[PDB]
Amino acid sequence: FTLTEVEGIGFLTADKLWDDPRRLTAAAVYALQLAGTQAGHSFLPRSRAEKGVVHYTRVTPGQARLAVETAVELGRLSEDDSPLFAAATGEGRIYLPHVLRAEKKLASLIRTLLATPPADAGNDDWAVPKKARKGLSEEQASVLDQLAGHRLVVLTGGPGTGKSTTTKAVADLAESLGLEVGLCAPTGKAARRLGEVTGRTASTVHRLLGYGPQGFRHNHLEPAPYDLLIVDEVSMMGDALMLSLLAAVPPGARVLLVGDTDQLPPVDAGLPLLALAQAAPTIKLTQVYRQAAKNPIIQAAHGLLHGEAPAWGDKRLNLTEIEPDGGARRVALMVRELGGPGAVQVLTPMRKGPLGMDHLNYHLQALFNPGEGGVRIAEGEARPGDTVVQTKNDYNNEIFNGTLGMVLKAEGARLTVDFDGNVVELTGAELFNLQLGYALTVHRAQGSEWGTVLGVLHEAHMPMLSRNLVYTALTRARDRFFSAGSASAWQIAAARQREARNTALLERIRAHLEHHH
DSSP states (O other), X not given: OGGGTSSSOOHHHHHTTOOOHHHHHHHHHHHHHHIIIIIOOSOEEHHHHHXXXXXXXXXXXXXXXXXXXXXXXXXXXXXXXXXXSOOOOSOOEEEOHHHHHHHHHHHHXXXXXXXXXXXXXXXXXXXXXXXXXXXXXXXXXXXXXXXXXXXXXXXXXXXXXXXXXXXXXHHHHHHHTTOOEEEEESSHHHHHHHHHHHTSOEEEHHHHTTEETTEESOSSSSOOSOXXXXXXXXXXXXXXXXXXXXXXXXXXXXXXXXXXTTSOOOSSSOXXXXXXXXXXXXXXXXXXXXXXXXXXXXXXXXXXXXXXXOOOOBTTEEEEEOOSTTOHHHHHXXXXXXXXXXXOEEEESOSSSTTSHHHHHHXXXXXXXXXXXXXXXXXXXXXXXXXXXXXXOBTTTTBOTTOEEEEEEEETTEEEEEETTEEEEEOGGGGTTEEEOSEEEXXXXXXXXXXXXXXXXXXXXXXXXXXXHHHHHHHTEEEEEEEEEOHHHHHHHHHOOOXXXXXXXXXXXXXXXXXXX
16 A cells, blocks of 8 residues: 555555555545645645545545544654644644645745845846837836846736737846846747747746756756746646746746736646735736737637626637537537648547547547558557647657657557657557547647637536636637537536635745744
8 A cells, every 4th residue: 555655556556456554544645645636735624634535445434534643643644733824724734745845845935035136146237228118018017127126026917918028028128138038838839939929949847947757957956047037827837846946046036927827727736826926026917909809719718707608609709509429520520611630729628528539539530530550549549640649758758748749650559750850659558648639638738829729618528617727728719719519518617616726835925924034
């Protein structure tokens, strides 16, 4: 059962391979793991931890109590009942030890960044000319002023706002002052877009941090060599990667974090951007561009925030009702009508089930790349001409999680794929870390943008029908968004604010600086 923690194997398999204290204390560890995985919680109150053990192992509640208690005293879980900023529930918090540590380290790192001024002894040479605020609004310009004598600044804003132009004004002003600017996003397509709009070279957060099988090269011992780090799409970053980034900022150096707080929350535990947007000096763009204002998609997205489903029927924003169980063929035909795979990106909330990703890919592949005798992968078959997605990091071939590839040939049980120039032949186990990429899930689509998007949505995706999911899906589209499924699925998404994550980061931050000195 000690296999619960070692990366790869877990409780799942160790259980159905095995009512003994060793099982129970590990089922406690497992209850917390599932907390992070499903709901993105950094912790669970004691009662909810105990309830998880009862659910996932079906012991008595005293056995679940003993399990959690045994896990704590052994160091396999952490209790915390410290009065943070708000303190009075009669109940302690339990964490995976490393998740409590990360949260405390991140809060501590955030506070020193907020409580210290920028410098190289105690210098300035960050000045704000009227030439620097050229064609910026009161708000967008204020980011340049806030950066003057603050090391951590946050820029939030929805799609209509001008974060691109604001980000460019920052990078321009900083390099004119002589500073080294580093540009940064969580995904490769986000990174690329940031380089394009700034007219510079950007990197994934992991590249910029020097990532490999050894971990991150850059950290407090060897900072990322930049006087100003610019990071975009921070909505996607959980506590863990935030910590790895912020810990890599040279002392006295600056960081500008830019995000859309209404996007989906991170996949990993935490809501750092949301915490930072509340504690750090944050510029919240509220002005939509004129050409953005007219865009139906941008308007539907803002309606979502008012818990209002989109108003369909526009040539740029419409919905065609389909039945999910047999409706994937129809989606493939809808894509053909739009000029095929090249002219439209299909998105779905989930991988499995009716109109899930696997369902859609089968039909997309059948209709646009018919054929036989390809190399079998995670699900279905890969053939030349097929798009592919890498689903976990290949450390040997240096292919990152979520890289899109083009299958050039599949011969025997060997797949030859071009990922973004990296032509690489794959076999064996690393064939099961590939999936067909005609249809992408909304989560895998985060940070990516297309001209037109076909978004599937139906009661069939019930658990995933949240406001944030439908907000992200919609903001993947620049020009046109077509939906397939049910109108009412959207109404259920719009009415449903996603669940509240357990995170104490904000509370820890406000502890560190407000009630201190």
